[PDB]
Every structure is written in structure tokens, then in C-alpha cells.
């Protein structure tokens, strides 16, 4: 059962943030050059308060959160975000991470209801 | 190429309405052979009867410093400045 529950963006500086291991090969004591999809240094990153709009995916996303209450549980990734296409749903619960890809008919404003 | 890749990191923080400075590399978490297109996304929140940040990746050349223990500890974003 679906339930029906825009603000100007805030921005922050990503000083040296979002670097990841480009591959799974072990290296040590070396400076290695790589070309990949990375978050540019000191870029302008959009800041939201958990305000949960649908965002463009572009070429990939760096995501971060600061919390002490486990409010952010997961994400929806897709194209049409309706039964017309396959969509990727990633959610976390108290024991497991659950990942599914289906022709999901998503709610207009999806969330997990906690009692 | 049809593969949905996730990298991640988890630390404590004592700062407030902003991201911390300093270097930290994100490790591979999962690689899923899904084979679908993604153009839009949304966050899923738990609501009872916190803040997040979104940045976008670009094709950039980096110089990565691997320490004696094989962990990346520093990096240069080659397209940032001269």
C-alpha cells in the first residue's frame, strides 16, 4: 500500500573525497596512474536533509551520509521508475541487504514504514 | 558494461553539517551482473509513525599513492590545476 506524504539546493566542498580502488590487484610502495570515473577534487556536492527528490544518475554517483540513527536504508536505481522497465532496488534491513531487479511499480513517494 | 559496481567506506565523524577533510579510499563492496540501464535514482528512508550528499563522477586521471601496506593513502587529481 502506497502513501502520499521543491527547495533550493545546498552545496558543500568535497576536498579530497570519493577516491576508490580502481581494480583488485595488490600493489604497494608505488605511485600508480589511472584513468577512471572519479569525483573531481574540491567539487560542489549537493547537500540534502533527511527532501528526497529523484536525481539524475549521469555517469555514476558518489553518495555519502552522516547520521546516528540509520535513517537511510537504501536506494532506487532505474530509468522510467515504473512497470514499463526493469529497475534496481537496494534495501537494508536489520539482518541483511536485499537486492532485486524487477518491473517494479514504485510509489509516488516510496519509503519504509517503521513502528 | 552491464555491471553495477558498488564501493564503500565507513568511519565515525565528529564534524557537523559538512564532509571531513583528509584522504580515505573506498573498497569494493559488490559487483552485480545485472545488465540494465540507469539514468535516475532516489534515496530510501525509514520513517517512524540525518543528512546526505550527492556528487557526480567524471572521467579523470588520478595519480594514486599505495603505501607499504598496499592501501591508498594519497592522490593527485591531474586535471585540477597546473
Amino acid at each position, epitope marked *: 500500500q502506497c502513501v502520499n506524504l521543491q*527547495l533550493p*539546493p545546498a552545496y558543500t566542498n568535497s576536498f579530497t573525497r570519493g577516491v576508490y580502488y580502481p581494480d583488485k590487484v595488490f600493489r604497494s610502495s608505488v605511485l600508480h596512474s589511472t584513468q577512471d570515473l572519479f569525483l573531481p577534487f574540491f567539487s560542489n556536492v549537493t547537500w540534502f536533509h533527511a527532501d528526497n527528490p529523484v*536525481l*539524475p544518475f549521469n555517469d555514476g554517483v558518489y553518495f555519502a551520509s552522516i547520521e546516528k540513527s540509520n535513517i537511510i536504508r537504501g536506494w532506487i536505481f532505474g*530509468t522510467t521508475l*515504473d512497470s514499463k522497465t526493469q529497475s534496481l532496488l537496494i534495501v537494508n534491513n536489520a539482518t541483511n541487504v536485499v537486492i532485486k531487479v524487477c518491473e517494479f511499480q514504485f510509489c509516488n513517494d516510496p519509503f519504509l514504514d517503521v513502528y | 558494461d552491464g555491471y553495477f559496481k558498488i564501493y564503500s567506506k565507513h568511519t565515525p565523524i565528529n564534524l557537523v553539517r559538512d564532509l571531513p577533510q583528509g584522504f580515505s579510499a573506498l573498497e569494493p563492496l559488490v559487483d552485480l551482473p545485472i545488465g540494465i*540501464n540507469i*539514468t535516475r535514482f532516489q534515496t530510501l528512508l525509514a520513517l517512524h509513525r540525518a543528512a546526505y550528499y550527492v556528487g*557526480y563522477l567524471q572521467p579523470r586521471t588520478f595519480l594514486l599513492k599505495y603505501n607499504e601496506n598496499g592501501t591508498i593513502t594519497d592522490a593527485v587529481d591531474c586535471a585540477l590545476d597546473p
Partner: antibody
Amino acid sequence: EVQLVESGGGVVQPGGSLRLSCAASGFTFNSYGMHWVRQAPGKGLEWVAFIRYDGGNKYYADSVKGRFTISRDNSKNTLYLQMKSLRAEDTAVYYCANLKDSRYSGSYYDYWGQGTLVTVS
Amino acid sequence: VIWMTQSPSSLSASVGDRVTITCQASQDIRFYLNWYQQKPGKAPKLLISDASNMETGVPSRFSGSGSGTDFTFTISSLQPEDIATYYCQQYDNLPFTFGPGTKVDFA
């Protein structure tokens, strides 16, 4: 809150050139790809060009391809269209817009500016 | 290039009448089609995306359906505020293309 404001319009001669711009506010300009669309007096809409969020890949209609250039500045939240070798047929109101698209731009919201008139005479 | 066309070029209808506008793509564009409404002196406003998905804030009297090359836009009960030109646009393949537009008059 969301605003798109075109400027740089006016009257030019055939074979000349003109630089149009569109200032953006109220939305994450640097997150979206942007389109240009034009409408001649008494006519329907014509799609002109598209640029990706990173200012990389660019696309043009055959009517402007090879003559017009699309660019952006994500630090100034501004979209630009540089037109060269203008013709009488290019007389139109030019609009900047974020067109809803589930394939290329990934835009969920649809926004348009007020438009700027360009006349070639 | 995928060309777009519309039929009729114009129609006349009264308040309470059902209005149907046909849009056709030169090639199969799945369900990827935007419907825009424009009044004189103003920028176009989106009413429908992905063929059938209604935009938030759009009155329930508006609808649309179709697939491939064949799309239809409907107003189930025309209001005096609905006198406008309607355009259909395909976003399946770049360059993107708009149809000629269908003009609705008040009879």
C-alpha cells in the same frame, strides 16, 4: 524558486554571429544536461542542441550543425549558445530548458526559461 | 533523424467535449514521448512523459496512451482554460524532435 533567464538577444545582419546565454538558479544546474530550443514567429518548436551535465558530449540539429556551438560554465551556473553564419531563417525566440528525459539527461523535472528574441536582417 | 507528425493540424471543440489529438513517430520510439501544452506568449509546459506518465499538478481530465509509432493524447472533458497548442516530442534518439503542433480552438 527555479529560474532560467536568457540574454544576449537582439538584431544582427546575415552572415554575422551572436552569443546567447542563460543564467540558472534554484536548481542543481551542474547536475543536469541542458537543451536549446527555438521558435520562429507563427511556427512550432524546433530542437537546437544538447550538452551533457559535465559539459562534454554535445549534440546538434542538422539545421544548425556546423554553424552553432553549445557550451556551459558550471561554476557560473550559465548555459551558452554561440551562433555563427546566421541566416534570415534563424529569426526566432530562443529558449534554454531542462527537458524531462529518462534516457539521456536523466531529468525528472521539466523547466523552461522566458526566451530571448533573435532577429536576422 | 526521427521525424514527428500530428493529426489533425487543428480542431474546434466546446466546453465539455472530448478532445483527441494524434501524434505519430517516423519510427518505433517505445513509450518514450513527451506531451507539451503551449499558450500564446508563454513557454511550453509538460503534461505527460513516457507516453502515459502524468506530471504532478496536471488535472485528471488529461490522459495519454500508445506505443511504437502510435500515440494519442486525450482531454476527457474540455475546459475553457484548455485552449492551446499541443506538441509531442520524442526523446528516444538524438537529435530530439518536436511535432508540428495541434491547435485547439474554442467552438
